[PDB]
Design an enzyme around this catalytic site. Structure first.
Site, short mmCIF file in Angstrom:
data_model
loop_
_atom_site.label_atom_id
_atom_site.label_comp_id
_atom_site.label_asym_id
_atom_site.label_seq_id
_atom_site.Cartn_x
_atom_site.Cartn_y
_atom_site.Cartn_z
N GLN E 11 0.50 -1.49 -0.05
CA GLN E 11 0.09 0.17 0.00
C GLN E 11 0.96 1.34 -0.11
O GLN E 11 0.20 2.13 -0.54
CB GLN E 11 -1.17 0.00 0.92
N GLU E 62 -3.15 -8.05 -1.53
CA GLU E 62 -4.57 -7.91 -1.77
C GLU E 62 -5.01 -6.84 -2.87
O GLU E 62 -4.30 -6.08 -3.29
CB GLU E 62 -5.24 -7.20 -0.50
N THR E 136 2.96 -6.25 4.37
CA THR E 136 3.31 -6.83 3.04
C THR E 136 4.50 -6.14 2.63
O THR E 136 5.47 -6.94 2.22
CB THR E 136 2.16 -6.63 2.20
N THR E 170 0.64 4.82 13.14
CA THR E 170 -0.68 4.35 12.11
C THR E 170 -0.44 2.75 12.61
O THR E 170 -1.25 2.05 11.60
CB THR E 170 -0.45 4.74 10.91
N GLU E 245 27.44 4.37 -8.03
CA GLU E 245 28.56 5.18 -7.49
C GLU E 245 27.88 5.83 -6.30
O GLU E 245 28.64 7.01 -5.75
CB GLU E 245 29.41 5.92 -8.13
#
EC number: 3.6.5.-
Lengths: 143, 428, 22, 426, 428
Positions: E11, E62, E136, E170, E245
């Site tokens: 997400q 999902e 995920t 969150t 580099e």
């Protein structure tokens, strides 16, 4: 009476073209299986033997047995060599004069001598199809 | 008068030579009809009035490559009798092209060879093109070349062989096809020039600088070597060669006649501005190993004989300037017993360019055919492909069932063993 | 029932009757 | 010139063939009534390879239709391009071999061979010199698997110097048509290995997988699936009809593929296979054609090729493509996928460049490959035979019509031996 | 052609990527229909004539967001099988992605990359886009990045991470998800650009003067960073530096490869209108504690390496004088053993801009990427947040119940403890 297809329209043929070369008329008909067989073969044969060199050694006048203006214009839109005019009564005159019955007869090439009378009959309703080149364009060149 | 009769057998032969003949037509100003708007004697006859028919025969057991020419733009250019088509393809067998189906063509083909050789005395030779890994390229090629040796005694036989690659093969039966051809190639041909495929892929990748050429671009470059090879016969030069002198130029023993090729310049028209092609620089590119047409590394090779045919406006002494410095250089290693090893012939007329081709018009060109001991790599690699595949009798029943005697593959290898050892014996 | 066929061979594409060098 | 006689046997063969002749007819551009339009020499110069003139300019295919029940032969008659076939070419059985190999072969079939050989040689001697045959049958049913394999044995002995290639549909892993599946297959394999030169395997479920994934069709009918075999079975024989740089033939690939005569069972793949959505989002070139054609979820046999090593493999490219881009890539994959091929064959792969692309499409390839990954597939039919033999299940439906129990014992012995050679050659 | 491949996991990276490829379509002038009305080869392929296709892969377990890309604007410009969608989301569990549910996509994903990577060599790097804290991004991100390390061991692969901030997280399982992530994202990756969210929250509120933003402005602002990072791969300039580099200059030792970012100017059309963004002050704003994008004061850490791509019109005079001024500043302390610390980059292409977004067209931009020791407490902050929750086993049984083992959590403890031990060892 005899037209040549150009970029844009049709033009009356110049009669001094037919001289110094060989002439065959091609009796055919759109919508026949054998005519659709033979039309491109004679196309490639014509282009090869005419443009393998500087100038023309043969030419073909196409005469049709089709039943519509639409089919006539259709075939003439893509056939490279000469054609006859549809409404001119020379086409039906050539039919009754040269003995095509309007099948096992079309297509036909009748090679014509300088006297307007035939110098060869050649047919395709047979097993052999290597028969295009059986016709000399060396004995019969028009003066 | 004096001429060379060309033979095309097998598909590789046909479409290489289809490019070779269209190069020759425009060399002498012959139209595809076959007329013209003492140059053309050595590759053409004259028929009736104004014509030029070639000195060539097409043979194949399949119609598909030969009839397609019959309907091409070269319709009346070839007489319709030396174009020969069988019924069914030889299908990648030595045996089938040699025993079963190969018989019914040689009986009519040798007749046309006789028909073409009976015009004038003093035949120069026979230029026969073939592939080696192919079916009809070997089997029909052997049967025709064997019969020609007995029937015509002492005339030379040039054979350009599209040799199977060191890397690619494009067929599985190639080691079985290649080895068997050699045992029937040693005592028949006189000069066998080895040509590769991915070499010319690699040439057109680097030198020509064109991203996607096809077989049609392979064949132009091949056609350019042949024209420069037989440039001496067609046109006068300051110092000429013949096709009957090459075998006296190149072979020290009768069983050693496997030579490479090279050509220069080979440049795009786009990069041509950055090279004013001088005699000093084209000769060095001729000896540079990434310009030869065979793909074998010559650094492990002692050179034995070399034959350069210069083309175009080249004066004799800057040739002599170039070759003086070439011989003293130690990157190009000559063998001890052959202290002189150069022939350099010169012709006047610069090489043509085909319209629609990929070559800039150059003013001078060098073509090289050389005998070297690097071919020991080309053969010892090939022998490895054989016995590994013959380890447990792969693909045997196809050859057995077609007509060959099982065990004939043994003396074919014993033959190639001797050709392996004499190269090793020479190099010391 | 077919429309008109527009693939062409490489051989037909490029080996046509070239003008001869003069 | 060169002639290929088509024979269609069984229900599956007659259905699969009716779609095949549709693909060939419009590749050559022939009106279903039989007449010609399309106006090209290059699609026409080799037309005797499959068709015959019939005094109306028309072309009647050199196909013979055979079945022991008249149900499906009127199906092809009433359906599309039914007007094209010859009514003399139809040969009827009025009884129907009900999925019984015994009556397909011995009892019921024997009195109809007297008719089917009549029409085949009537078409055989009509030309100059025959080249080969091709037969479409499924090795599930009875009138294809047994009634077909007898016609294989009869025409082989009459003309032993010709060839034949059979497009054969086998059993499936899980799902199962024709519950007496392993009986009809095993009895046919030990006859087909003895009398046929080349056999292209097809499975329904690799073929069900392709149309679910690549074509992206939720509900696949027989028509759309046969259209996917018919294009491959048209692709293998392009080279007979159309010119090219590196030509090929059935016999050209017959000798180039099989090392030893008893193993000649081949896999088929085709590319490109693009749905509606992804048609505009592929940039079709020779690179991804090779990557599509070497994909486990692309072959039409339900065998994962990653288990075995490819023994010999051929690629009939089709169209105008450049030729190092051809050859260098088969070199690429053979060197990159060093474990996926077999060491004792230098240059495993084979190529062919047929110069005319399929209709509308521009760059196509048709992959035929002799793998050793059919180790698992024939050992699958093997143990299915052993599972249904020790209990002696469904044996009475065969034995009562002159069958012999000795035939089944030889059939397993003669087919477990074919497994032996696949595993032997690693 | 020289190129770089893009991977978006989860997400976070997906709608970052939505903000990413929006710009690149606008940068190269291609309309959303997919057609325009060599420079883009490093990010876009060709489909026929005029159609350009992105070279990226999307990956999420999902479909609720993968479908959101497909039915959105980019219905035709993207490729259908380019987007990979699973069945069930990992749902804030490292165990759900890395162990159980991820395996059904890895085999599909590996094959995608292999088909994308092999065709042209001279590939440069990969670009991950994932959140450390999401499951995920951490889970399925790891096993894909693990598998790529084994296969292409020779190859660079960049990471972009959204690290948990000191206040905003969150999620409740952020300390578990992160410390498990970096154990298996220290070894496998090469360079990881650390970013926080609440850093950019106070960025939007101070400079870009908007008092409450959302994700479509956060991703719009990280897309300007990445476009300024990799313009040097796309377009030319006086001096450009690529992927391969960064690691040469910035990573002194194999462990110390977690670094910050800052971008100047961050100014709306309010003030882009109203002053110079001169080289003498855009670099001052770059070094300011406000402008850095990883939420820690550099006052309580030591700078060790900096990389400054000025993009837009800078003549070389202004760079070097501005650089010398920064050495003289006493508040910014380098590490004593590293005299060089700045690797200047000047590009000539002007800075890009989205249409209708808050980012203003500015005449010159600086994107500064900074290896500093100020990361030391940011690692110890998450270590302390791990210590609370691990003390009596909270939310462990979710990970254990999926297939993980208790004890590999312990192994991550001395792994992150070693990482904090290294920074305090280096920075003295």
């Amino acid at each position: 009476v005899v037209k040549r297809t150009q970029q844009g329209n049709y033009v009356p043929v110049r009669p001094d073209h037919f001289a110094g070369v060989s002439v065959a008329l091609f009796f055919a008909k759109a919508g026949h299986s054998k005519c659709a067989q033979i039309v491109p073969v004679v196309r490639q044969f014509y282009k090869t033997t005419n443009f393998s060199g500087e100038k023309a050694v043969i030419e073909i006048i196409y005469v049709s047995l089709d039943k519509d203006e639409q089919d006539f214009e259709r075939v003439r839109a893509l056939m490279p060599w000469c054609s006859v005019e549809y409404k001119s009564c020379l086409r039906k005159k050539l039919i009754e004069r040269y003995r095509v019955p309007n099948s096992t007869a079309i297509p036909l090439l009748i090679v014509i001598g300088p006297n307007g009378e035939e110098a060869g009959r050649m047919n395709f309703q047979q097993s052999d199809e290597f028969v295009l080149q059986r016709w000399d364009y060396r004995f019969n060149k028009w003066p | 008068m004096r001429e060379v009769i060309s033979i095309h057998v097998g598909q590789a032969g046909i479409q290489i030579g289809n490019a070779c003949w269209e190069l020759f037509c425009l060399e002498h100003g012959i139209q595809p009809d076959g007329q013209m708007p003492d140059a053309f004697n050595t590759f053409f006859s004259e028929t009736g009035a104004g014509k030029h028919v070639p000195r060539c025969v097409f043979l194949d057991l399949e119609p598909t490559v030969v009839d397609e020419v019959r309907t091409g733009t070269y319709r009346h250019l070839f007489h319709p009798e030396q174009l020969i088509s069988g019924k069914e393809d030889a299908a990648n067998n030595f045996a089938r092209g040699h025993y079963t189906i190969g018989k019914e063509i040689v009986d009519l083909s040798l007749d046309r060879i006789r028909k073409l050789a009976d015009n004038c005395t003093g035949l120069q030779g026979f230029l026969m093109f073939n592939a080696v890994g192919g079916g009809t390229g070997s089997g029909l090629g052997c049967l025709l070349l064997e019969r020609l040796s007995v029937d015509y005694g002492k005339k030379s036989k040039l054979n350009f062989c599209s040799w199977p690659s060191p890397q690619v093969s494009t067929a599985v039966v190639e080691p079985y096809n290649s080895v068997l051809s050699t045992h029937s190639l040693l005592e028949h041909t006189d000069v066998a020039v080895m040509l590769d495929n991915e070499a010319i892929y690699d040439i057109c990748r680097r030198n020509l600088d064109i991203e996607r050429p096809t077989y049609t671009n392979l064949n132009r470059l091949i056609a350019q070597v042949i024209s420069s090879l037989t440039a001496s016969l067609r046109f006068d030069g300051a110092l000429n060669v013949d096709v009957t002198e090459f075998q006296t130029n190149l072979v020290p023993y009768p069983r050693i006649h496997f030579m490479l090729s090279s050509y220069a310049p080979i440049i795009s028209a786009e990069k041509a501005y950055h090279e004013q092609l001088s005699v000093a620089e084209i000769t060095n590119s001729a000896f540079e190993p990434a310009s030869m047409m065979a793909k074998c590394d010559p650094r492990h090779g002692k050179y034995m004989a070399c034959c350069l045919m210069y083309r175009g406006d080249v004066v004799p002494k800057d040739v002599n300037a170039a070759v003086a410095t070439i011989k003293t250089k130690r990157t190009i290693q000559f063998v001890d017993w052959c202290p002189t090893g150069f022939k350099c012939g010169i012709n006047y007329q610069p090489p043509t360019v085909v319209p629609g081709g990929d070559l800039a018009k150059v003013m001078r060109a060098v073509c090289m055919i050389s005998n070297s001991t690097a071919i020991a790599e080309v053969f010892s690699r090939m022998d490895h492909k054989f016995d590994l595949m013959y380890a447990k009798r792969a693909f045997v029943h196809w050859y057995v069932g077609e007509g060959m005697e099982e065990g004939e593959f043994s003396e074919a290898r014993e033959d190639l063993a001797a050709l392996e050892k004499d190269y090793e014996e020479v190099g010391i | 029932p077919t429309l008109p066929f527009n693939a062409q061979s490489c051989y037909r594409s490029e080996y046509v009757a070239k003008p001869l060098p003069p | 010139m060169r002639e290929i006689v088509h024979v269609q046997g069984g229900q599956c063969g007659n259905q699969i063939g009716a779609k095949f002749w549709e693909v060939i007819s419009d590749e050559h551009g022939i009106d279903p009534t039989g007449t010609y339009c399309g106006d090209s020499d290059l699609q026409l110069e080799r037309i005797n390879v499959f068709y015959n003139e019939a005094t109306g300019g028309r072309f009647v295919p050199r196909a013979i239709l055979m079945d022991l029940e008249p149900g499906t032969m009127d199906s092809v008659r009433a359906g599309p391009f039914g007007q094209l076939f010859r009514p003399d070419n139809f040969v009827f059985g009025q009884t129907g071999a009900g999925n019984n190999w015994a009556k397909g072969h011995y009892t019921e079939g024997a009195e109809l061979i007297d008719s089917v050989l009549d029409v085949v040689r009537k078409e055989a001697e009509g030309c100059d010199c025959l080249q080969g045959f091709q037969i479409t049958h499924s090795l599930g049913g009875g009138t294809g698997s047994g009634m077909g394999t007898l016609l294989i044995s009869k025409v082989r002995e009459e003309y032993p110097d010709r060839i034949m290639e059979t497009f054969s549909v086998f059993p499936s892993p899980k799902v199962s048509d024709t519950v007496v599946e392993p009986y009809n297959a095993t009895l046919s394999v030990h006859q087909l290995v003895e009398n046929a030169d080349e056999v292209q395997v097809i499975d329904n479920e690799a073929l069900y997988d392709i149309c679910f994934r690549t074509l992206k069709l939720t509900t696949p009918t027989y028509g759309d699936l046969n259209h996917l075999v018919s294009a491959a079975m048209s692709g293998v024989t392009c080279c007979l009809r159309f010119p090219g740089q590196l030509n090929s033939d059935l016999r050209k690939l017959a000798v180039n593929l099989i090392p030893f005569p008893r193993l000649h069972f081949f896999l088929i793949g085709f590319a490109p296979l693009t749905s509606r959505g992804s048609q505009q989002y592929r940039a079709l070139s020779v690179p991804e054609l090779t990557q599509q054609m070497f994909d486990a979820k692309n072959m039409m046999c339900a065998s994962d090729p990653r288990h075995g090593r490819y023994l010999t493999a051929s690629a009939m490219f089709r169209g105008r493509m450049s030729t190092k881009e051809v050859d260098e890539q088969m070199l690429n994959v053979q060197n990159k996928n060093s474990s996926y091929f077999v060491e004792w064959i230098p240059n495993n792969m084979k190529s062919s460049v047929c110069d005319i692309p399929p209709k509308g499409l521009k760059m196509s390839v048709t992959f035929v490959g002799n793998s050793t990954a059919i180790q698992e597939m024939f050992k699958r039919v093997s143990d299915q035979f052993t599972a249904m033999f020790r209990r002696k299940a469904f044996l009475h439906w065969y034995t009562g019509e002159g069958m012999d129990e000795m035939e089944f014992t030889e059939a397993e012995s003669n087919m477990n031996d074919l497994v032996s050679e696949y595993q032997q050659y690693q």
